[PDB]
Design a protein around this ligand. Structure first.
Ligand SMILES: *[C@@H]1O[C@H](CO)[C@@H](O[C@@H]2O[C@H](CO)[C@@H](O[C@@H]3O[C@H](CO)[C@@H](O)[C@H](O[C@H]4O[C@H](CO[C@H]5O[C@H](CO[C@H]6O[C@H](CO)[C@@H](O)[C@H](O)[C@@H]6O)[C@@H](O)[C@H](O[C@H]6O[C@H](CO)[C@@H](O)[C@H](O)[C@@H]6O)[C@@H]5O)[C@@H](O)[C@H](O)[C@@H]4O)[C@@H]3O)[C@H](O)[C@H]2NC(C)=O)[C@H](O)[C@H]1NC(C)=O
Ligand SMILES: *[C@@H]1O[C@H](CO)[C@@H](O[C@@H]2O[C@H](CO)[C@@H](O[C@@H]3O[C@H](CO[C@H]4O[C@H](CO[C@H]5O[C@H](CO)[C@@H](O)[C@H](O)[C@@H]5O)[C@@H](O)[C@H](O)[C@@H]4O)[C@@H](O)[C@H](O[C@H]4O[C@H](CO)[C@@H](O)[C@H](O[C@H]5O[C@H](CO)[C@@H](O)[C@H](O)[C@@H]5O)[C@@H]4O)[C@@H]3O)[C@H](O)[C@H]2NC(C)=O)[C@H](O)[C@H]1NC(C)=O
Ligand SMILES: *[C@@H]1O[C@H](CO)[C@@H](O[C@@H]2O[C@H](CO)[C@@H](O[C@@H]3O[C@H](CO)[C@@H](O)[C@H](O[C@H]4O[C@H](CO[C@H]5O[C@H](CO)[C@@H](O)[C@H](O)[C@@H]5O)[C@@H](O)[C@H](O)[C@@H]4O)[C@@H]3O)[C@H](O)[C@H]2NC(C)=O)[C@H](O)[C@H]1NC(C)=O
Ligand SMILES: *[C@@H]1O[C@H](CO)[C@@H](O[C@@H]2O[C@H](CO)[C@@H](O[C@@H]3O[C@H](CO[C@H]4O[C@H](CO)[C@@H](O)[C@H](O)[C@@H]4O)[C@@H](O)[C@H](O[C@H]4O[C@H](CO)[C@@H](O)[C@H](O)[C@@H]4O)[C@@H]3O)[C@H](O)[C@H]2NC(C)=O)[C@H](O)[C@H]1NC(C)=O
Ligand code: CA
Ligand code: PT
Ligand code: PT
Ligand code: PT
Length: 1377
């Protein structure tokens, strides 16, 4: 009975058969569930269910009966099935099939509904006797994202099937059995089934908004009744209403959806209830008032992640993690509590800190470092104070002089190399002479004969008294040509000054063989260099235990840490942490490690891979119950416990050397539990044999002394290859990121590798690896775990590893830090402090729940409207707990909620009277008749949406008008999910920077030019508009491919994850595709694309004009604008439109305008980037579209474009604007009229701000402008517009009209070609005498009038009606056609 508004969304691809959709939804990523169900339907088991409901009903019984899903997983299945999450995954198959299979399968297909593909040969029969073809094109055997494999087999077999028919069942069984035997590996690909209809897909998981477009009025339903200054209490009174209500969750939803309507209805019946002002004790401690914050098991979620799809993927990932933990008898509550524990988060913060290594001589008994200083005893520094306050009282960029030991620098030098020697002589000594407060040491490098000798020479001379003498040899040797070999001619003169007085020393060129000098000194030195990996092609310098490689201005690097260390000391001093009797260098050495490994301590701190240990022993039980295992000792302590697994190629010296070290390390550490996985490069000989050789010798392996005993044990014994072991072996490596013949080391789930050389990982390297790993991951788990009293659950080394490994996985970055939010992956428990009695309500059983949600919603917020709606539906799921906190603000200067909101989502599928799946829609009932409303779509980030069906003006909705024009109080509108985004964040390799101005091309096997875009400066951002299918990204041929080669598109993650050296993208989800591509510069390039070392016309048109209209009137005016151009030019014109702001009525009309006026048209759009600052106000969005995305909105093939406003009319042949010289400027604009005499008052660009800023430059008009696009992109103007906009936009009152104001603010930075004013006329600011020579007319809003735009047009232009009549009769001609 009530006046209603209904909005629905449909996808750009037809609905896949329900059967296949349930198969896919059901088996998310578990293959066993997939083929176990594929058997069931090939029985013909699912043939007897006639309707979708019955079919759905059948799946529930099956899954429950076969043990596939438990209540928790079943509930999750229903929600994912409502969401229709599997539909794009199925469409990926079809698009792949349509575009790569059919054109590479030459011949005549009839009866070949299904067909296996074997060795590039097609077989239409199960009996496999005859083969139709040699399939053309690239290999289809490439394993791609949507593939499934069943079994391991030398041969690879693919079946392209239409499951729907019964013709499928025998083909399946042929290859299912063939795989069950082990002849070949089986996989299913889909074929679009013609039994099913080509009806489009009805989607859900989006939001609809009805925005009040008139907010200006402030002091069943007709119009909202407003309110005076009492705004301040809205949030507060709104929060109370709910608390009081009795069924609070429902209230919030009912209140929050129709909130603008209930504003005046608040403040009634002794409303405030001031008990809830008690809990600002909880605002005093943690979050600011009116802020929306969501947590999922401690994880703080960003707004983008708060949609149904984003949330389904998070549960899926989270449950996998927790379930792993709760097989050790922990409740979901206990598991989460452990993950977010204080001791755990402390460790992440702990090793976010920079790493230092112990540079001391202590281990090598003080005989390796030859210091050029001592600050406590050098009689250079005698003058200086040895006081702590000297440090603390130092400001500036310098360094305080002090007689104390505080800063140290040890530099390893090769005495053969001139450049290396030069460092000590010039570099190091100057610093000494200069009285720098840094102690300087150096240790010689011994990698060649001559080097060994020269270390001996210098070292020995020093050891047993010589100082200045050794220095002297070095200096003389360096200056005296270039000595990279000992020179006696030079050496002998140095000795001539007989300063060798302090206690007897040997003399001559006998390069000493003294067991003390040659052996101890040189071997001790080598032990220091090896220990800290301080040698090689690139040696390593240690400043305060901080490794700085000896490359390009390392002293610049040193100075940076020198200042950073000094500031670190000062802070401790002002807090009185420091005292006078202290060794200051040991403030840094507190956490320093004795040994240094680049694998354990990579310089890229993020580089970390951890595997779920429970998973490893669950998936590969067949493998891991038959690997040689050294159990960790019976009588060792929990603190000692650790689990180690070594993966190695025992058919290589490095592979077996690595294992010998691991075995050696095990003898020493009784607590470790060792596993050996033999991973061979060549699988001609079964891997099971060598594993079987060792497990027999398992008792006897740890009981030995020599390497050959291990070598010999590998050779001896006769064994039967367990091919079942071999299968689980190759599955393990595939699941883990591991190649064949590659060496890896796994301690408590953490993987290091591949190990290229076994000298990289020695016995001493395992010891530090355990020491470091122990610290971070094991000790924080142990403490935290014990604090909760769950320390009964640890029963051994393998038992422990399950927990430590899981908690390490919980804190993994992906989504990468610095992209969506800078904040680290730390699970807070910080809201547990909050009192809950009067602001919170919970839904779900906390005792059973695996998912714990903590929502902090401000009822007065518009963001809250969506949050409540989504959370209600996720709250309905079994095994989920939710707790809500309401936190309003007292700061309400403007109206809080200015829209109505509906979320299209269900927790389980709904069925028809005919049993078909119910489509979902947003229905607003009892809409006020007199309020002007705007329809908006609040769609997931990867989606691009436009109106398809609507007869109404969605930008100007009023029920009274529709009733008085259409006769109906009921409105229906249908949208189309036209595109889904492929978006990514680029980087250059190895010196990672965003490659800006790089051009990209998206392609498919059908067409090599799907789309094109250019790389942005901000996060190396780029995007493509696409739908489900298999694509490829090639750098655009030209300057881009000249400078770069892209190794990869980051489809696996930030990585590099091995196996991702690919350029293939596929989208099979409603979340699109997120990519992290990598591009490495070609041989010796410091080049830039942006600077140099009839095409567009042919492709498009002579003239390219683009525009936007946001209403039926403005669209009607746009029709006139296009016509005026056409009458005024006999040239070829192409029109470009901003697709999403236009009505379907307009959209359905243009082909008819194009036939009549003879122009070409193209619809364009771009999705507003996530990083780029949003516009809550639609009019402002539109303005942003005209200026911010000029370089990326139009295809690269377009040389230039012209913007003409909708209300405009043109009397000129528009080419002239193209031919207009821009004198090296990217875009051209027309200025504001000065000609009108008496208008001055309203000319605001002659005021202080605009006249001070625009020193001499004009105040330009955004109604008309030219963009020399080739130059625009070449100058990279867009990036500058975007970052200045983002920076300026922080202030809300910054840009009144951004479109005009941005080019004006940027005309100093970016040239603006100024146009002849013959190019623009407006009555408001130009005289009537001016219009004779006027080229085009804008209808600028007169502010001294209220005469409407329709009136100005008829009065101002007499030919306006002539244009309108033409359109009017044509519209009727079409309607009567
Ligand atoms: C776009 O599309 C079309 C086709 O491609 C075309 O559009 C033209 O636009 C004009 C308006 O700009 C149309 O109107 C005519 O404009 C002229 C003014 O130039 C008017 O005089 C004319 O009225 C009468 O005369 C027409 C023909 O007379 C003209 O002839 C001379 C032009 O040169 C050609 O002459 C003949 C063809 O006639 C040919 O053999 C030659 O090789 C030349 O190519 C010119 O010297 C004339 O001027 C004298 O005479 C007039 C009186 O006629 C007098 O007033 C003058 O003082 C002078 O002594 C004269 O212009 C005739 O066709 C009309 O029917 C009418 O009787 C129109 O109002 C025009 O119809 C139209 N077509 C052409 C081909 O011109 C353009 O090619 C395209 N335009 C753009 C912008 O892209
Ligand atoms: C000035 O600068 C100094 C130097 O930088 C700073 O001094 C102290 O720095 C410590 C941090 O490194 C803080 O810890 C305190 O230590 C003292 C003494 O150290 C004890 O432990 C040592 C550890 O031994 C191991 O390691 C060394 C190598 O590092 C190795 O050689 C050993 O073999 C061994 O493996 C011992 O070497 C040392 O002999 C001594 O035992 C300690 O007294 C502090 O303890 C306080 O708190 C505990 C409870 O946490 C309490 O039990 C203590 O009671 C004492 O008194 C009763 C009754 O007489 C007696 O029964 C006990 O046996 C205790 O002796 C005591 O109240 C603490 O652990 C320390 O904070 C820090 N400063 C102070 C003031 O303590 C510091 O900046 C300044 N200190 C001074 C005094 O100048
Ligand atoms: C992909 O999907 C498949 C199928 O949906 C999943 O595979 C399932 O995994 C189950 C894992 O537990 C497995 O259960 C096994 O059942 C046998 C027979 O009872 C047990 O011998 C196995 O050993 C494990 O558990 C026992 C003790 O548990 C049993 O007894 C208690 C009562 O005392 C019962 O509560 C319990 O349910 C078990 O019956 C231990 O002693 C062993 O040491 C060992 O840990 C397994 O429990 C299923 O057979 C298997 N298939 C099906 C149809 O459910 C697969 O997990 C999934 N993968 C992913 C990634 O989720
Ligand atoms: C969540 O909800 C709880 C509900 O209990 C709030 O707790 C209140 O906390 C305040 C501040 O601590 C309490 O007020 C004070 O209590 C003192 C007694 O407790 C102290 O001593 C015990 C040991 O005996 C300690 O364990 C404890 O930590 C306290 O230190 C009184 O001595 C205080 O009196 C002082 O102030 C008054 C008023 O100015 C003077 O007249 C006195 O002479 C004296 O100087 C004081 O009363 C309060 O009792 C607690 N309860 C309530 C209902 O408020 C949490 O604050 C709240 N947290 C959040 C984040 O919202
Ligand atoms: Ca205008
Ligand atoms: Pt400095
Ligand atoms: Pt401090
Ligand atoms: Pt991003």
């Amino acid at each position: 009975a009530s006046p209603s508004i209904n909005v629905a969304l449909k996808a750009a691809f037809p609905s896949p058969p329900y059967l296949v959709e349930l198969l896919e939804t059901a088996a998310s990523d578990n293959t066993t569930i997939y083929y176990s169900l594929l058997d069931r339907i090939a029985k013909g088991h699912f043939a007897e269910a006639t309707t979708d409901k019955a079919l759905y009903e059948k799946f529930l019984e099956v899954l429950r009966d076969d043990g596939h899903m438990d209540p928790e997983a079943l509930s999750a299945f229903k929600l994912a099935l409502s969401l229709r999450t599997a539909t794009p995954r199925v469409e990926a198959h079809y698009q792949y099939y349509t575009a790569t299979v059919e054109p590479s399968l030459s011949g005549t297909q009839e009866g070949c509904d299904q067909w296996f593909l074997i060795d590039g040969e097609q077989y239409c029969s199960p009996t496999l006797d005859t083969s139709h073809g040699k399939v053309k094109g690239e290999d289809q055997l490439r394993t791609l994202p949507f593939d499934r494999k069943f079994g391991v087999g030398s041969r690879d077999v693919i079946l392209y099937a239409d499951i729907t028919s019964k013709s499928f069942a025998p083909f399946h069984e042929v290859a299912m059995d063939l795989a069950k035997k082990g002849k070949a590996s089986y996989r299913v690909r889909y074929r679009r089934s013609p039994s099913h209809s080509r009806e489009s897909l009805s989607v859900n998981g989006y939001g609809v908004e009805l925005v009040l477009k008139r907010t200006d009025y402030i002091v069943i339903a007709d119009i909202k009744p407003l309110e005076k200054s009492e705004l301040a209490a809205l949030g507060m009174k709104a929060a109370s209403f709910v608390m009081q209500s009795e069924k609070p969750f429902e209230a919030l939803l009912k209140l929050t959806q129709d909130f603008p309507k209930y504003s005046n209805s608040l403040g009634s019946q002794n409303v405030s209830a001031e008990f809830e002002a008690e809990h600002r004790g909880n605002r005093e401690v943690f979050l600011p008032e009116g802020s929306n914050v969501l947590w999922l098991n401690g994880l703080h979620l960003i707004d983008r992640q708060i949609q149904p799809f984003g949330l389904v993927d998070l549960l899926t990932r989270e449950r996998k993690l927790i379930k792993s933990v709760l097989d050790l008898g922990l409740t979901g509550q206990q598991a989460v509590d452990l993950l977010g524990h204080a001791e755990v988060a402390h460790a992440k913060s702990g090793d976010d800190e920079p790493r230092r290594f112990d540079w001391r001589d202590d281990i090598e008994e003080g005989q390796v470092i030859i210091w050029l200083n001592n600050l406590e005893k050098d009689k250079r520094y005698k003058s200086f104070s040895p006081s702590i306050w000297v440090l603390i009282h130092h400001f500036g960029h310098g360094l305080p002089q002090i007689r104390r030991d505080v800063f140290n620098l040890v530099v390893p030098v090769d005495l053969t190399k001139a450049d290396d020697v030069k460092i000590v002589v010039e570099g190091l000594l100057s610093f000494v002479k200069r009285l720098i407060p840094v102690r300087f040491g150096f240790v010689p490098l011994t990698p060649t004969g001559q080097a060994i000798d020269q270390a001996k020479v210098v070292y020995y001379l020093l050891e047993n008294y010589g100082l200045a003498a050794a220095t002297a040899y070095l200096e003389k040797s360096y200056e005296e040509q270039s000595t990279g070999q000992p020179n006696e001619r030079i050496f002998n003169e140095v000795i001539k000054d007989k300063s060798l007085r302090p206690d007897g020393v040997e003399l001559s060129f006998k390069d000493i063989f003294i067991s003390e000098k040659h052996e101890k000194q040189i071997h001790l030195s080598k032990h220091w260099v090896e220990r800290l990996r301080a040698g090689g092609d690139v040696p390593t310098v240690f400043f305060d235990g901080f490794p700085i490689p000896r490359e390009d201005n390392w002293l610049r690097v040193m100075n940076h840490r020198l200042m950073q260390d000094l500031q670190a000391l000062q802070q401790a001093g002002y807090f009185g942490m420091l005292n006078e009797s202290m060794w200051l260098p040991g403030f840094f050495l507190e956490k320093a490690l004795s040994r240094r490994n680049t694998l354990i301590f990579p310089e890229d701190k993020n580089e970390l891979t951890v595997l779920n240990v429970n998973k490893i022993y669950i998936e590969n039980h067949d493998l891991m119950s038959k690997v040689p295992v050294i159990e960790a000792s019976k009588e060792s302590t929990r603190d000692d416990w650790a689990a180690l697994t070594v993966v190695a190629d025992l058919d290589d010296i490095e592979g077996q050397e690595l294992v010998y070290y691991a075995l050696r390390f095990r003898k020493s550490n009784d607590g470790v539990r060792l596993d050996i996985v033999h991973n061979p490069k060549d699988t001609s000989r079964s891997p099971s044999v060598l594993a079987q050789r060792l497990k027999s010798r398992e008792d006897k392996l740890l009981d030995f002394t020599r390497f050959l005993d291990l070598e010999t044990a590998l050779e001896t014994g006769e064994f039967e290859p367990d091919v079942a072991y071999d299968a689980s072996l190759a599955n393990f490596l595939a699941s883990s990121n591991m190649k064949a013949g590659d060496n890896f080391v796994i301690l408590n789930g953490r993987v290091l590798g591949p190990i290229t050389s076994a000298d990289d990982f020695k016995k001493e390297d395992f010891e530090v690896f355990l020491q470091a790993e122990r610290r971070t991951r094991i000790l924080p788990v142990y403490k935290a775990l014990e604090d909760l009293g769950l320390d009964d659950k640890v029963s051994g080394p393998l038992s422990a590893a399950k927990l430590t490994s899981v908690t390490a996985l919980s804190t993994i970055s992906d989504l990468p830090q610095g992209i969506f939010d800078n904040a680290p992956t730390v699970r807070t428990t910080l809201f547990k402090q909050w009192n809950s009695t009067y602001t919170s309500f919970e839904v779900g059983d906390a005792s059973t729940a695996t998912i714990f949600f903590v929502a902090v919603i401000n009822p007065a917020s518009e963001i809250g409207q969506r949050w409540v709606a989504v959370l209600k539906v996720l709250s309905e799921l079994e095994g989920v707990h939710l707790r809500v906190f309401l936190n309003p603000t007292v700061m309400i200067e403007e109206l809080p909620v200015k829209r109505f909101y509906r979320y299209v989502l269900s927790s389980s599928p709904s069925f028809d009277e005919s049993g078909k799946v119910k489509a979902l829609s947003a229905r607003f009932t009892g809409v006020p008749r007199e309020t002007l409303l705007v329809v908006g779509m609040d769609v997931p980030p990867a989606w691009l949406v436009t109106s398809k069906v609507a007869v109404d003006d969605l930008d100007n909705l009023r029920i009274k008008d529709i009733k008085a024009k259409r006769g109906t109080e009921h409105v229906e509108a249908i949208y189309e999910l036209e595109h889904i985004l492929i978006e990514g964040h680029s980087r250059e390799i190895p010196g990672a920077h965003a490659p800006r101005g790089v051009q990209l091309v998206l392609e498919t096997e059908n067409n090599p030019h799907f789309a094109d875009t250019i790389i942005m400066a901000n996060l190396g951002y780029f995007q493509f508009k696409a739908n489900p299918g298999v694509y490829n990204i090639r750098l655009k041929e030209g300057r881009s491919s000249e400078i770069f080669t892209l190794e990869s598109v980051g489809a696996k993650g930030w990585g590099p994850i091995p196996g991702d050296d690919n350029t293939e993208v596929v989208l099979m989800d409603f979340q699109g595709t997120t990519l992290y591509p990598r591009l490495r510069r070609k041989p010796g390039m410091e080049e830039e694309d942006v600077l140099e070392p009839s095409v567009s016309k042919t492709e498009h048109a002579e003239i390219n004009i683009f525009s936007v209209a946001s209403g039926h009137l403005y669209e009607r005016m746009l029709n006139i604008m296009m016509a005026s151009v056409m009458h005024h030019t006999n040239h070829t014109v192409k029109f470009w439109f901003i697709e999403q702001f236009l009505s379907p009525s307009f959209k359905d009309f243009i082909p008819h305008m194009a036939a009549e006026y003879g122009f070409k048209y193209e619809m364009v759009t771009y999705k507003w980037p996530h990083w780029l600052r949003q516009q809550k106000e639609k009019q402002r969005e539109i303005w942003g579209y005209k200026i911010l995305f000029l370089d990326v909105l139009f295809p690269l093939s377009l040389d230039k474009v012209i913007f003409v406003d909708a209300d405009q009319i043109v009397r000129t042949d528009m080419y002239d604007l193209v031919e207009h010289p821009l004198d090296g400027a990217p875009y051209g604009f027309a200025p504001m009229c000065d000609s009108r005499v008496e208008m001055e008052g309203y000319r605001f660009w002659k005021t202080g701000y605009w006249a001070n800023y625009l020193k001499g430059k004009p105040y330009h008009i955004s109604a008309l402008y030219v963009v020399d696009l080739q130059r625009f992109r070449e100058l990279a103007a867009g990036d500058r517009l975007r970052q200045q906009y983002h920076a300026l936009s922080a202030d809300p009152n910054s840009l009144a009209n951004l479109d005009q104001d941005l080019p004006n603010h940027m005309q100093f930075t970016i040239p603006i070609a100024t146009l002849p004013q013959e190019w623009l006329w407006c009555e408001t600011w130009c005289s009537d005498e001016t219009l004779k020579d006027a080229r085009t007319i804008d209808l600028c809003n007169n502010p001294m009038t209220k005469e409407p735009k329709l009136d100005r047009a008829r009065r101002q232009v007499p030919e306006w009606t002539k244009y309108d009549e033409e359109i009017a009769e044509l519209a009727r001609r079409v309607r009567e056609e």
